[PDB]
Amino acid sequence: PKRLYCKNGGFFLRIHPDGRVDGVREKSDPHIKLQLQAEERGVVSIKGVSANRYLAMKEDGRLLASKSVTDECFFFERLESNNYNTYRSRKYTSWYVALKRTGQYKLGSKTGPGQKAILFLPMS
Ligand SMILES: O=C(O)C1=C[C@H](O)[C@@H](OS(=O)(=O)O)[C@H](O[C@H]2[C@H](O)[C@@H](NS(=O)(=O)O)[C@@H](O[C@H]3[C@H](O)[C@@H](OS(=O)(=O)O)[C@H](O[C@H]4[C@H](O)[C@@H](NS(=O)(=O)O)[C@@H](O)O[C@@H]4COS(=O)(=O)O)O[C@H]3C(=O)O)O[C@@H]2COS(=O)(=O)O)O1
Known part of the structure; x- marks a missing residue:
């Protein structure tokens, strides 16, 4: 039961009950x-407690939430400097969960490992 605080702008990831992320x-x-x-060491599913949906990364780069687990719902969790974590799609292996400075999700396809948009500070 945490909160993922994104370093790019200072927005917390959100998962709405209709599928919108x-x-x-x-x-x-x-x-x-x-x-x-x-699911194992280094791999996690991220679910929004209220909405009861999992975060999923689709083939066009979009981020959305799905009511049931699909191979688009898993991510490698990797620790970065200063305690920030990054989540990279186990399916689209070079795409990272990320948020733009405006708060809206960034498409995974436009992400990369040195961007500030992929860094999340996990908070209870
Ligand atoms: O693909 C694009 O759409 C795109 C690519 C190009 O990078 C650039 O287009 S170009 O034609 O000018 O070359 C333009 O880049 C956007 C970028 O896509 C946006 N990132 S997003 O917010 O995730 O959507 C954004 O970038 C700003 C972000 O805060 C961050 O970007 S990222 O790392 O998450 O990808 C980045 O942060 C800087 C930070 O500001 C610096 N701090 S300082 O106080 O200035 O010293 C410093 O710490 O470095 C980080 C990261 O290093 S980097 O920026 O060198 O990569 O950059 C921010 C910023 O540049 O505004 O905006 C850029 C520019 O968009 S604009 O509307 O044209 O201004 O689009």
Whole structure:
């Protein structure tokens, strides 16, 4: 039951109950409560507690939430400097979960390992 705080702008990842994924700056938003469950060492599924959906990365680079687990719902969790974590798609292996400075999700296809947009600070 954490909250993923993105370094690019200062937005918390959010998972809405309709499938839409985005960021907010309000820390009391109930849709920013997440549950990361490891499938093994280094691989996690990220689910939005309220919405009961998993974060998924689609083939066009989009981020959305799906009610059931698909091979687009898994990500390698890797620790970066200063305790920030990054989540890279186990399917689209060079694409990273990320948020643009405006709060809207960045397409995984436009991401890369040195961007600030992929860095998340996990908070209870
Ligand atoms: O593909 C594009 O759409 C795209 C690519 C190019 O990079 C650039 O287009 S170009 O024609 O000018 O070459 C333009 O880049 C965008 C970039 O896509 C945006 N990233 S997003 O917010 O995720 O959408 C954004 O970048 C800003 C972000 O905060 C961040 O980008 S990223 O790392 O997450 O990809 C990045 O942050 C800088 C930071 O500001 C620096 N801090 S300092 O105070 O200035 O010293 C420093 O710490 O470095 C980081 C990361 O290093 S980097 O920037 O050198 O890679 O950059 C931010 C920024 O540049 O605004 O905006 C750029 C520019 O967009 S603009 O609207 O044209 O201004 O689009």
